[PDB]
Design a protein that fits this description.
Elements (H helix, E strand, L loop, with lengths): L2 E7 L9 H8 L5 H9 L3 E3 L2 E2 L12 E7 L12 E4 L3 E6 L16 H8 L20 E7 L2 H12 L4 E9 L6 E4 L2 E3 L7 E3 L7 E9 L3 E8 L6 H8 L22 H9 L5 E9 L6 E5 L4 H16 L7
Parallel strand pairs: 7-14
Antiparallel strand pairs: 1-4, 2-3, 2-4, 5-6, 6-7, 8-13, 8-14, 9-12, 10-11, 12-13, 14-15
Helix pairs in contact: 1-2, 6-7
The structure holds chloride ion (CL).
Chloride ion binds next to loops.
C-alpha cells in the first residue's frame, strides 16, 4: 500500500466548505470518498490537530496535513485467434460475444483479461496495449501493442490518421451512393444503451462505399478516421441505413416482398450488427515497413450476404418455378 503525505492551506474563498469538499479541491489527485475515509480514520490534521468530521466547515487559512495510505484486472484463460505477432505487435481476429476492455456491465471476461493471460509482460503497457476498440458483437481485426515504444507510436499513427481500418457491413435499405458521415458523436441524452450524433459530441468521420446492391439491403465497405464508441452503427443509423441485426439501432427486420423461407429465416435469426473489421493497414511502429492483414468474412455474414445476393439475382427476372 502506498504512503500518502500531503500538506496545503485552505484558500480564503473556500470559507464555509465542508472539510471533505475543501480537501477535494486542494488535492484533486484523490477521489472525494478516499478523502472522506482519510478524515474519518483520524488521518487528517487541521492546524496540528486531528479532525475527523468530514462535514465540518473550514474557514480558509487552515493548515492541513494528511498521512495516509492506499493499496487491477485479472489474467483469464480466454483463447485469442492470433493472425500475426512479432516482437512489437499482435493482430487478433476477435469473435462476437467478446468485449475489448472492462467497464460497467463487464468487469472481466474481456480481450484485456485474455492478453494479460497470453502475455503477462503486457501489463507494463497502458491498457494492455489496446489502442482501438471493436464492439462486443463486431467481429474482426484489432491491433495491440506489446511494448511501451510500440504503443506510443501506434497512438501517434492513429492521431495522424495513418492507420487504415476497413470494415464490411450489411445495412438496411437501398443506398444510391458511397460518401462520408462527418458528425460528432456523444452519449445519447436519454437512452443509456445508445450513442447519438450530437453537436457537442466528439468529432467522428466515417467513409463508406457500396460493394453490392440487394433488394432492400446494401453491402458496404467503410474506413474510419476516428474510432468513437459505436461509430459505424450510429453514423449508419443517423443517415437512415442502420445495420442489419443491430440490436440497439435497428428496428424489426423488413424482408422484401416474396422473400424465400430461407431468406426470412436467416434474416430473423441474425442477432448482431452485420459488421466485421476486415482489413488493417499500417506502418509498423518499429520498422516503419507498410503492412496489411485481412480477416475472412465470418460464416454468419457469408450466409446472410449469399441469401440476399441470391434473392436480388432471382428477382431480376419474372422467374418463380
Ligand atoms: Cl466496432
Amino acid at each position: 500500500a502506498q504512503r500518502v503525505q500531503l500538506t496545503a492551506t485552505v484558500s480564503e474563498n473556500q470559507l464555509g466548505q465542508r472539510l471533505d469538499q475543501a480537501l477535494a479541491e486542494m488535492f484533486p489527485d484523490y477521489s472525494r470518498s478516499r478523502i472522506k475515509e482519510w478524515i474519518l480514520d483520524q488521518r487528517v490534521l487541521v492546524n496540528g490537530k486531528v479532525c475527523d468530521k468530514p462535514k465540518e466547515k473550514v474557514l480558509g487559512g487552515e493548515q492541513v496535513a494528511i498521512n495516509a495510505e492506499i493499496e487491477r484486472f485479472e489474467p483469464q484463460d480466454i483463447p485469442l485467434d492470433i493472425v500475426y505477432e512479432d516482437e512489437d505487435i499482435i493482430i487478433i481476429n476477435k469473435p462476437r460475444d467478446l468485449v475489448v476492455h472492462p467497464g460497467a456491465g463487464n468487469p472481466d471476461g474481456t480481450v484485456l483479461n485474455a492478453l494479460l493471460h497470453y502475455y503477462p509482460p503486457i501489463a507494463d503497457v497502458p491498457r494492455a496495449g489496446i489502442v482501438h476498440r471493436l464492439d462486443k458483437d463486431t467481429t474482426g481485426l484489432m491491433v495491440v501493442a506489446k511494448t511501451v515504444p510500440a504503443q506510443t507510436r501506434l497512438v501517434e499513427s492513429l492521431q495522424r490518421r495513418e492507420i487504415t481500418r476497413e470494415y464490411e457491413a450489411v445495412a438496411i435499405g437501398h443506398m444510391t451512393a458511397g460518401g462520408t458521415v462527418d458528425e460528432p458523436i456523444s452519449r445519447h441524452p436519454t437512452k443509456r444503451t445508445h450513442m447519438a450524433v450530437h453537436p457537442m459530441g466528439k468529432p467522428a468521420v466515417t467513409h463508406y462505399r457500396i460493394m453490392e446492391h440487394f433488394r432492400v439491403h446494401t453491402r458496404l465497405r467503410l474506413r474510419l478516421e476516428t474510432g468513437r464508441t459505436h461509430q459505424i452503427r450510429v453514423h449508419m443509423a443517423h443517415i437512415t441505413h442502420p445495420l442489419v441485426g443491430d440490436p440497439v439501432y435497428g428496428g424489426r427486420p423488413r424482408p422484401p416482398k416474396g422473400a424465400s423461407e430461407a431468406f426470412i429465416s436467416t434474416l430473423r435469426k441474425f442477432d448482431r450488427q452485420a459488421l466485421h473489421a476486415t482489413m488493417l493497414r499500417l506502418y509498423h511502429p518499429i520498422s516503419g515497413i507498410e503492412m496489411e492483414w485481412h480477416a475472412p468474412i465470418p460464416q454468419d455474414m457469408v450466409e446472410l450476404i449469399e441469401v440476399m445476393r441470391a434473392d436480388f439475382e432471382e428477382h431480376k427476372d419474372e422467374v418463380d418455378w
